[PDB]
Every structure is written in C-alpha cells, then in structure tokens.
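Inputs:
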Amino acid sequence: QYSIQQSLGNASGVAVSPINADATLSTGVALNSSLWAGIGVFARGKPFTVLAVTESNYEDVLGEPLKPSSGSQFEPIRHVYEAIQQTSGYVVRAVPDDAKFPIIMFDESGEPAYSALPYGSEIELDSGEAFAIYVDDGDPCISPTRELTIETATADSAGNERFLLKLTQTTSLGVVTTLETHTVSLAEEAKDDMGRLCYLPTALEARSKYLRAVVNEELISTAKVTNKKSLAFTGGTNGDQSKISTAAYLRAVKVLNNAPYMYTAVLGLGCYDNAAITALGKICADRLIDGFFDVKPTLTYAEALPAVEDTGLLGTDYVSCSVYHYPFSCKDKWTQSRVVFGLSGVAYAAKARGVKKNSDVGGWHYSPAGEERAVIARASIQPLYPEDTPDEEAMVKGRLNKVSVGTSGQMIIDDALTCCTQDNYLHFQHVPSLMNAISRFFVQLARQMKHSPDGITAAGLTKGMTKLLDRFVASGALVAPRDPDADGTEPYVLKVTQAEFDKWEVVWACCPTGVARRIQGVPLLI
Amino acid sequence: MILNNQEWLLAIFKKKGLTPTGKLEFATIDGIDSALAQALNEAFDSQVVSFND
Amino acid sequence: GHNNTKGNRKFIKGRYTANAAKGERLVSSEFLLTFAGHEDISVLVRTSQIPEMTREDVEDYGPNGVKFNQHGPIRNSGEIQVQCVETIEGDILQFIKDRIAAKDYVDITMAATPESKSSGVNAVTKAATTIEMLDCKIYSDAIDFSTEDVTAAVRPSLRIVYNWIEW
Amino acid sequence: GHNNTKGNRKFIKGRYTANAAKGERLVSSEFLLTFAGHEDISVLVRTSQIPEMTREDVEDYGPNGVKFNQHGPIRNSGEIQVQCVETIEGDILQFIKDRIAAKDYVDITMAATPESKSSGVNAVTKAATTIEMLDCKIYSDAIDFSTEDVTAAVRPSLRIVYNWIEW
C-alpha cells in the first residue's frame, strides 16, 4: 500500500475524502406518467419563468430548503418534495419587489465595479465601461459566496487574445469549491481549442448555466483585461419572502396559464391567498383538468368550514376541484423540528398511483381516497387540537374532505369530494375525471382529422368515437345500467340526429362506474 | 367548460355540402390531333450533321 | 337441430378489444446474455432460459384424510441450458478451456431487448423483464462432429448452474 | 390494434453488422483424427466428438434451506463415439483385431481443419481448436450385416475411453 490523497487533481489516482460526521444520501428516479404544476416561493431560481424539475434536479434547480425558523416560507418545497415522488412537473417562482441580482462591470483598464439591479430592469452600460457580467440564476450570493477569477491564456492561432474565466463557490466556514471554467475572447471572430466560438456573450449563453454578459459595442475593440484574484458579487439580496403581495401571485398564475407543456394536474403548493386560488381554479376548469387545493391547516374545526366558502371555488363553475384540511403536526424530514403543513401533493400522489394501474387509457375511474392509494407517510403525528371532534355531516354538506387512521396505523384520506353543491353524481371525484379524459381524447382526435382530404365529417366522427368508447369500456370505466328492464344493456349510446341539412348534432351518453363508500352491517340472534 | 346540468358542449364545426345539378360538360378530342402533330416535330429537332455531302 | 344456438358478435368484439388493449407479445428471438467481464461472447449465444422460480412444498395430513400443502424455503440453485455457435477461431473452446483451468464464479444477466423499445443503435432494457443470476459455474457437454452434415454448423451445448436469483 | 409498435431498422442493422464482425462459423464436416502411430486410418473416420470438459459438484445446505454448489475435482476419463467406414480389405477389422490381441494405449488428437485456413495441399491447425487425449483404449461394437440394404455401406462403431485431456 501507499499514500492516499483527499481531493482529486489532474493526476490519475484514487482519493478518499475525510469522514463526515453528519450528511444525508438521497437517490432519485425519473418518470413522466402525469405532469403537475403550481407556484411557490423558493431560495434560488429564475423568477416568472416555467421551470421543469425532476427527482434529481429539485435540489440544484429550486434550492436548499428554507429553514422553518424563518416562518411561512418552508411549505412550498415540502409540497414539491411530496408530490415529486411519483412524477415530475413544472414550477413558476414568485419573488417580492425588493429583490435584486448582483452584477460586476469592467473598466477599459480592467478594474471591477459592483452594483445590483431589480429583476425587472435591464442592464444599461455607462460610457467608459467595456463589458459587464451578472448572474442569470435567481440566486443571491449572501450565504454561499461566489467569486470570479480572471487569468491569461495562450493567444489564438490567428493572433487573437484569449483569457480564462473561472467561477468558484465558498461557504461561510471557508471551504472553497470549483464550479465552472471557460476560455473567453473579447474579439468577435475567435475560436476555441475545440473549434467552438469564444465570443463572451455567445459562449456564456451557450455553455454556462450561471453567468451572462453584456458588452458595449462601441468601446469593445480597444479593451484590455489583466489578471485579477477572486472577486465576489455583492448587493444581491431577496426581500422578506414571508410577505408576498397578491400582484406577484397573480403574475405567476398568468405565467402558468400561457404554457404549452400540457400538464394533467394543478396544485396549490402552500399558497393561502384566495385570489390566487380562484385564478388557479379558473385555469383548472379551462383545460379540463383536475385540481387540488388546501385551506390553512392551523384553523380549528369550527373555522375551517367558513374558510371553504371564503374561496370562490364552491359553486357550479369549478367542478373537479378538491379542498383539504389537515390540522395535525409532524417531524420535518430535513430537520427534525416539528413543522406543520397541509395536504397538497399527497392527494395528487394518490391520484397518480391510481392512474398508473392501467396503461392503455390510464384508468381515471379510481378515486384518490382509500387505504391503499392514499397514505400519509410522516414521522410522528400529534393532533393540534385534541379532545375535539369534527361534525362529519356538516363537512359533507360543506364539501370538505377528511382524514382518518387506517387499519395498519398510518393516517389515511377517507373521502374524495369535488366543489359542486348540486346533487348531480358530480361531487364524486372520478365522475368528472372520466368525462374530462374522454373530452381530451376527442379533442386530440378531432385536431388530427382536420388535416384530411375531406375534413371534419359526421361519418368520420363516429368511427373514432366508437373505438375510443370501446377502449374505455374495456378498461372498466363504463358499466352496464343497473336495471336491465328499464334501460338497455349497452354501456354507452352514440347517436347522430339530422334535423335540417345545415345543423347536425353528435351526442354520446355514458354510465360511470360507482364507488363503495358507505357500508352497514346488521347483527341478528337466533 | 360550458356545462349545463350533466351535459358538456365540446365544439362547433363548419361543414360544406354539395348538391348536384343534372348538367354536364365534357372536352373534345379535336385538339389531340394538333398536339400530336406538334409533338412529332421534336424528333427532327436537336439533330445535326457534322460534314455536308 | 340445436335450439340453444344464438349469435352475439358484440360480445366477441368486446373480447377482441379487451385482448388487443395490452401492448404486444414478446417474440422468443429477442434476448441478451452478458456473462459479466466477458462481453465479447454475447453475440454468439443462440438459446437461453429463465430460472424456475419455485419453492419447496410441505405436505401434512390432517384429521381424517384432509391434506394441506404449505410454502417452504426458496429454491436457489438450478441448471440452465445454453447453446452457442462456434467460429473458426475457437472462441467458445478457448472460453471453456479458460473456465475449466481456473475455478471461477461468473455473474450472468438475462434481459429481453425488443425492437420496439429501443433508441438509436442501442437497446434499452426494462426492470420488469430483467433477471440476474450470481455465482454461476459454466460447464460444457460433448460436441458432435460428423461428415455428411454439410448444411449444419457446429453448436456446443453449455450447462450453467446458478446459486442465487436476484431482481 | 397494438399501440406499442414502433419500427427501428438502424438497431437491426447494427445487430447484423455486430454478428457479421466475427469471421465465420465452423462447419461440422471439417475435422481430423490421428491415432498416433497408425496414421493410415485417418481417412476412414466419419464421426467424432469432443470430450465432456466438466467438473464434479458438491452440494451443501446452509442455514434454513440455503444451498450452494461448489467446484470439485476434474473429470479425467470418459467415452467417445467414433464411426468408421469399412473397405473390402478389412482395414478397420484388422486394426481392431490387433488392438484386442495386444493390450495397448494410444494417444488420439482431434483438430479442426477448415478450408479457409490452409496453405497448399496441406491443412494447418490452430492451438485454440485443437485438443488431445492420452492413454486411450479402442473397443468395437456389434457390426450389422443384412441384405436388402444395397444402397448402404457397412459402418462399424468404435468406443474409445480416454484417461487425460491435454491442450
């Protein structure tokens, strides 16, 4: 045996880092069965843009979870972590107005100048300044310090001058790590050792995920750069993130609305603003999609019911939107600190588990509630308001869902109701879900056959619908009518009515599968 | 989502229908002779003789 | 003649759609063996198998003649028959000679690689259809050579004994 | 019908090239036996074999029902079935008579001689495809004679037991 190094350099060897007394190892996996969406507040991230996060990116993208001691800023990341165990999704970040990002400007001689600007604003280069480098990622450099290093390199083959740009990260303790390195040339027409372009803005846009640059075209030609030691970004900060105005929330919701990624669920990740919830419900009803929302968990049983009516969801417009209430407490995963947060992303997990059962059409008839699909996996549960009992009938009248302890011992979601006051077989969760899935399939069918020599025709619209309805019958979503004498044995009836030549009409009826939720036993004695 | 009672309204399309009339029109075979006469000439074109005799 | 005959093709159509609802049927010609560190032989395999996946059974006769069969311990070790083709450079013979000369245990991976589930020129495997066998011993059988078999190619038969099945 | 179907012929082309990368496949009609000092009989052979090339196995049942198979001693001796054609001068019969009359041990070499790897009128052998048997005993079986077999030539069957395999 021989010596063992602690860190790897450029030599060929095997290194072992010192033993770490405390650390956590996490393993992830990727799956794209169903796509969710939402809004929230996080540590770092490009604000007001759609971000795609998987199980292996939700730490790099987004950021390190915020400490619960800050208050009201930790819920969204916990909801995202709970929901991401099934499939990936999309997130839009909302940031307060008093938020700035750092930037360093360079003089013709090469000295740096530090400043910060609001996220909305655009960089304007003062006369006498050659170029500026700023941070594209919405990451303030307060607790982790980011330093920039410049040194010279060999000149280009065609006589152009190039230099090395390096980025480093330093913690509060003093541990220094290396993030990125680049070869950059100020000349417009320059090439890398690998043949790629070395123009600073183009290279930074292409092969860097942290930095961007803006140059002044007039004075770029007669510019000189000298070697500089580590220079740290300053002035980049995030305002108080516990106080977010409704305007930012509405802007994030509007950003979600105009997205082409075609997700299949919308989630309220710890957002307890009524206007934002109503906007999210409007988005949910627009796209023929399911939706899950949550009321504030700290409210008692008595105050929870009016809080459901406070949001505008309760009515006939917003069908297939569910509201949950969870006044319990649990130990946080990252730090065992006894945090409280609601149930959003646990219901979606149950729905995704139900959907994964069928592979042809998805099997949307499975209800989210149940002791098998829906389980709450948390460390230790302690009721916030013991010796208190909810009024179950009032909750049912109020379209509020409840939770209960299962046979195994873990907490279970025991009901699934949508926000529809009328008695239309629609307050059951799956009944709108089947019809929404069929409607989406029909829309995709009708979009495709428009590009046909004839176009949209009544004869063409019947064959495809018969095929799709037969597939849905095969999956078990549609069943024959209960009374065979009064109604026919067919599960669905598809017919076309003529009327006049100009006006046609295509209609199909369906008999949805039932759910078993109330059971009664009657003992007797011989 | 236009939803009334338990029924949805999904889409409305525009369709065009054709109703025939008894009238008919057909072409004449008179121009085919002229077309053939013109086409025959391209055989003799693009032909050259190197030396006169 | 028969008074119970009655035709119903909606039922048959429903059965057809239900059967066709599932994706595909795996063709028996699509598989791959790995052989751990000797990955140059994977091309020459021509026949393989999947382990038994059974348990021992315990028989108990109760009162009167009542009998019950009970689950027992898992069966670990078994045999697998593998056939390979032979080249004119003695790849299979050299492999068998090396394996006999030095006592070794080799891990063998069996997986199904259909054409439908593939990207580019590389086959992609699924965890559901992948099985593994550890601590295997590779043995050979008699190899038959004969004239008047001008249309045939020599194919050694290999016998592999595994000691653990993992998935 | 099936929604999982997708065609990909680049993958199939890659598999075809990978299989064709190796040289050829040995035809079963190309071999040769030597029989040590009696090299005039090598022409008349018509069927041969390669020895078993195996090991004994030792079975041990661990705690609960866990079972392990372990390598054992090599197998030295075995049998090989060889068929020869018969001439009207009794070369094979005289050979068998002489072998029975005097107790002898003969070394037998089996090699593969493909037409592709040959120079001149002389075949060349490869160390990878050549195996040797030492201290062999040659025995005969019953030879069948019958009328109405006008289209067949008599083919005696030989049984050879080897005692060591070397390469």
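The longest strand of chain D covers residues 131-140. Flag for discussion at group meeting.
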